[PDB]
Design an enzyme around this catalytic site. Structure first.
Site, short mmCIF file in Angstrom:
data_model
loop_
_atom_site.label_atom_id
_atom_site.label_comp_id
_atom_site.label_asym_id
_atom_site.label_seq_id
_atom_site.Cartn_x
_atom_site.Cartn_y
_atom_site.Cartn_z
N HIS A 199 23.78 -42.81 41.27
CA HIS A 199 24.70 -41.88 41.97
C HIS A 199 24.27 -40.46 41.67
CE1 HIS A 199 28.51 -40.73 43.90
NE2 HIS A 199 28.48 -39.70 43.06
N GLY A 200 24.01 -39.68 42.72
CA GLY A 200 23.74 -38.26 42.56
C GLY A 200 24.93 -37.43 43.04
N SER A 201 25.04 -36.22 42.52
CA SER A 201 26.09 -35.29 42.91
C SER A 201 25.68 -33.87 42.59
CB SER A 201 27.42 -35.64 42.20
OG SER A 201 28.52 -35.25 43.03
N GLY A 208 34.02 -33.09 36.47
CA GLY A 208 35.00 -33.96 37.11
C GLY A 208 34.64 -35.44 37.03
N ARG A 215 35.29 -41.56 41.73
CA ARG A 215 36.54 -41.81 42.44
C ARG A 215 36.33 -42.12 43.90
NH1 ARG A 215 37.23 -36.21 40.88
NH2 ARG A 215 35.22 -36.97 40.11
N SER A 241 19.83 -41.06 46.11
CA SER A 241 20.88 -40.41 45.31
C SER A 241 20.54 -38.96 44.87
CB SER A 241 21.29 -41.26 44.09
OG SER A 241 21.96 -42.45 44.52
N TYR A 244 21.36 -36.05 47.00
CA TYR A 244 22.74 -35.60 46.88
C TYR A 244 23.02 -34.70 45.69
CZ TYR A 244 24.00 -38.64 50.75
OH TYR A 244 24.14 -39.22 51.99
N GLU A 329 22.48 -48.91 50.80
CA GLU A 329 23.47 -48.26 49.97
C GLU A 329 24.58 -49.23 49.71
OE1 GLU A 329 26.06 -45.29 52.82
OE2 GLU A 329 23.89 -44.94 52.89
C1 LIG Z 1 27.83 -39.09 51.97
C2 LIG Z 1 28.27 -39.61 50.61
C3 LIG Z 1 27.19 -40.45 49.94
N1 LIG Z 1 26.60 -41.47 50.53
C4 LIG Z 1 25.78 -42.02 49.64
C5 LIG Z 1 24.94 -43.12 49.71
C6 LIG Z 1 24.15 -43.49 48.65
C7 LIG Z 1 24.22 -42.73 47.48
C8 LIG Z 1 25.09 -41.63 47.38
C9 LIG Z 1 25.11 -40.85 46.07
N2 LIG Z 1 25.92 -39.81 46.01
O1 LIG Z 1 24.33 -41.11 45.16
C10 LIG Z 1 25.87 -41.27 48.47
N3 LIG Z 1 26.80 -40.31 48.69
C11 LIG Z 1 29.48 -40.50 50.84
C12 LIG Z 1 30.26 -40.42 49.54
C13 LIG Z 1 29.82 -39.11 48.87
N4 LIG Z 1 28.73 -38.54 49.69
#
Ligand SMILES: C[C@]1(c2nc3cccc(C(N)=O)c3[nH]2)CCCN1
Length: 350
Positions: A199-201, A208, A215, A241, A244, A329
């Protein structure tokens, strides 16, 4: 040998905490996203205002769905921009009319939500950094670069870097084991098909994520912002990921999370459906099927989770209707199907 006497926070944890708790970086990140921090300082942003923002985006969604473009849609976009101020300088504020544009506004609010959390959290005899770390209620333990875990995770990182994400490479700068209070006990250990997934952010969001866990989307968020519904999203390709992370040549340090995901039986889908959650009917997760994925012949396991090492190869999956995902995904709709396990500090090489 000072640590044998005084027992300090490991320097690598201090630097991590300094990094994710930097409120100035959060301000700059939101300004890049066109949010007007001068009109609406982040310190004064409330959960109610963000919620009201989502409700305006829902009005926009209603308009897009009905094909509307006149008064109703203008009123909706103006309402949204009133509630969540933007800075477009001298340019006409743009209409929000597509799924991608709706999704971008949704991600802006997701970031604002994690920022609101962080600014509260970072507000004694205790050093500010010890205080921030404690307040996460999330253990972070640096791991040895010569450990087995480090080797497998570097392999996973590099070998699942996708061929169509060739605008950067990644260097693993440091690795932390994550133990979030509660997750071990809540976790759906029973389910089969437990995988260690990415998971990337954005950098603004880790205070958070670490303090609250991953969440599901806000209940007032437009559903059409979410390709397979309001679940927690994961990839098996590190770069899907990492994209993102929204890292850049200017800000080339990001983080990537590995979690154990209790997938159980997956409902497999070939194309977007925001109502996917309702299609589960007893199954435990949604898998969006991609053209290219790691293949099981190369998998290894780490402490009971399947690690899907690459390279990726053709899955033999084509949609005979239109668009096919490049890569898989995975979506779960309850946080108890998630146990955070590692956090990678990544250098992006552009
Ligand atoms: C578009 C969206 C998103 N789609 C993903 C698909 C695979 C990985 C990730 C991740 N963050 O690593 C994703 N994030 C929907 C939920 C938050 N952002």
């Amino acid at each position: 040998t000072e640590n044998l006497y005084f027992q300090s926070m490991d320097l690598r944890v201090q630097e991590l905490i300094k990094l994710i708790c930097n409120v100035q970086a959060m301000e700059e990140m939101m300004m890049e996203m066109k949010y007007n921090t001068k009109k609406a300082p982040l310190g004064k942003l409330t959960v109610a205002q963000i919620k009201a923002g989502y409700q305006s985006l829902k009005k926009i969604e209603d308009c897009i769905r009905a094909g509307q473009h006149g008064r109703a849609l203008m009123e909706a976009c103006n309402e949204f921009y009133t509630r969540i101020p933007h800075d477009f300088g001298l340019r006409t504020p743009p209409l929000i009319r597509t799924q991608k544009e709706l999704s971008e506004k949704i991600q802006l609010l997701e970031a604002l939500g994690d920022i609101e959390i962080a600014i509260k959290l970072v507000k004694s005899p205790e050093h500010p950094l010890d205080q921030h770390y404690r307040n996460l209620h999330c253990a972070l333990r640096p791991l040895d670069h010569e450990s087995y875990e480090f080797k497998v995770i570097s392999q996973y990182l590099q070998s699942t870097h996708a061929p169509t994400h060739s605008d950067y490479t990644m260097t693993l700068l440091d690795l932390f084991e994550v133990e979030k209070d509660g997750e071990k006990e809540a976790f759906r250990e029973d389910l089969h098909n437990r995988m260690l997934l990415w998971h990337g952010s954005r950098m603004s969001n880790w205070v958070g994520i670490l303090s609250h866990g991953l969440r599901i989307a806000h209940p007032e968020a437009p559903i059409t912002g979410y390709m397979f519904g309001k679940g927690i999203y994961f990839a098996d390709m590190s770069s899907k990921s990492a994209n993102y992370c929204f890292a850049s040549r200017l800000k080339n340090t990001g983080l990537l999370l590995l979690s154990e995901v209790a997938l159980g039986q997956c409902n497999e889908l070939l194309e977007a459906n925001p109502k996917a959650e309702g299609l589960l009917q007893g199954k435990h997760s949604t898998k969006g099927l991609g053209k290219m994925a790691p293949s099981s012949a190369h998998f290894v396991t780490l402490n009971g989770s399947t690690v899907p090492l690459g390279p990726a190869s053709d899955t033999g999956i084509l949609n005979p209707d239109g668009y096919t995902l490049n890569y898989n995904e995975y979506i779960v709709y309850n946080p108890n199907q998630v146990r955070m396990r590692y956090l990678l500090k990544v250098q992006f090489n552009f």
